[model samples]
Target: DADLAKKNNCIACHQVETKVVGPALKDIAAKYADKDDAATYLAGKIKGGSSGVWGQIPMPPNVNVSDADAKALADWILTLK
Candidate 1:
């Protein structure tokens, strides 16, 4: 989990346990699970810089990752427990 995200610069903001540059994986998954299009919605955030979801530390869009990669990342993050 951390390995994949780290390769893609995602660890700049997220982690499985600790909040580094951003929130933790458990934090993101818990907060977004109730959303209608959780996977789809998070893909956007994972790509396009997002705000407000986790306060001021905006998630800079991850243009380096493909749509499939983003979805995969989101899906795996959902299994934080």
Candidate 2:
């Protein structure tokens, strides 16, 4: 799992349930009930980071991930529930 995330460079700011530099993926999914909307929202968020959504810590923007990877990440995040 670490290798997969590492290869995609998603570990830079995110983790499954732990509080890394950014909020845990599970928490984000819990906050938003609808997985589809959450996926889209996070896809956009990944491309462009958010403010005040997860306290003072600003999730730095990640430009490397493609649209498919972003969506896949969002789906993976939903599985934390």
Candidate 3:
């Protein structure tokens, strides 16, 4: 759901093509392209937040995003590239 990210306000800090407060979606797709667990891992990060991997800025937890939505977002993100 494209509206999922927007509804969760992820657009406030991220974009598909360029970095904002967080890395770009396509960049994220590329970085995790080789990981078998990319989708699950990214889903966890989306719901629980992440840091130190990309930079020190840290991606804050998305409290409004459910596990299912996070997984969907992760799956969609990986398809960017």
Candidate 4:
């Protein structure tokens, strides 16, 4: 997952621990942990871009990210403690 984030440059705007242009992956995990479809939700957010949810800093669409990778990333993110 770390490799994937780096390869896709997702860490440019997001971090596993700290907030950057967007919320931290850990925070996102906490926010959606209880939701049954957190993976689906986050995968969509990743691929489609996100805005107005964690302030004005909107996350850009990850066009280079694949559906499989997006889902895997989302699942990995949800595992952060």
Candidate 5:
């Protein structure tokens, strides 16, 4: 799962504990912890990308990330404390 994030360059802008260009993965997990569809929502963001939710620096849509990989990445991220 970590490998998928790395392969998709998610590591370039995000980290498990520290914020890089985007919010930390842990923070994201915490923010969405109560959401019932957190994984699905995150998966959409991974493929469709998002902006303003974090900051002006938008997350570029990962065209290379397949639906399965995106879902896997989202689920893995939510597991972080």
Candidate 6:
């Protein structure tokens, strides 16, 4: 999971327990805690990028990561908390 995040530069702005340029993984998990399609939504965000969700420091699109990897990363992130 770390490998996937690293490969996509997700680690540059996020961590398991703390916030950086984005919110913490667990915080994200908690925010979407009730959503069944959190992974799906996050996967899209991973590839498409997002803004205003975690404030103004937008998460730019990760063009290097495949869709499957993005989904996998999202699933793994949900596992954090």
Q: TM-score: which candidate is best?
A: 5
Enumerate clash totals for all models, in the order shown.
1, 0, 0, 0, 0, 0
Please give the RMSD to the true structure for each candidate, in Å. Answer: 1.4, 2.0, 0.9, 0.8, 0.7, 0.9
User: Which is the winner by lDDT between candidate 1 and candidate 2?
Assistant: 1
Ranking by TM-score: 5, 4, 3, 6, 1, 2
Model 3 agreement with the true structure over 13-66: per-residue lDDT tens digits? 889999988998999999999999999999999999999998888888899898
Per-residue error (Å), model 2, residue 36: 5.2
- Regions of candidate 3 where Cα sits further than 4 Å from its true position: none
List, residue by residue over 48-80, the lDDT tens digit for candidate 2. 877887787776677787888777776677667
Q: How good is model 6 by TM-score?
A: 0.93
Q: Please provide TM-scores, in order, for all candidate models, with all chains considered together.
A: 0.86, 0.79, 0.94, 0.95, 0.95, 0.93
Estimate, for each residue in 3-73, the C-alpha lDDT of model 1 and write its tens digit: 77888888766778877777888888888878888878887778787888678867778889988888888
**Native-to-model Cα distance after best TM-score fit, residue 58 in candidate 3, in Å:** 1.5
| Candidate 3 steric clashes | 0
Badly placed stretches (over 4 Å) of model 2 are 1-4
For model 6, residues 1-81, the per-residue Cα lDDT tens digits are 988888778888898899887999989888887898899999999999999987877888988989899999999998886
Q: Which portions of model 5 show Cα errors greater than 4 Å? A: none
- lDDT winner among the candidates? 5
| Runs off by more than 4 Å, candidate 6 | none
- 61 Cα displacement, candidate 4 (Å): 0.9
- Tell me model 3's lDDT, rounded to 2 decimals: 0.90
The TM-score obtained by model 2 is 0.79
lDDT agreement with native, every candidate: 0.80, 0.75, 0.90, 0.90, 0.92, 0.89
TM-score of 5: 0.95
Report residue 54 deviation for candidate 6 (angstroms). 1.4
What digit string (tens of lDDT, one per residue) describes model 4 on residues 1-81?
Answer: 889888888888889999887899999999997899889999999999999999987788999999999998998999999
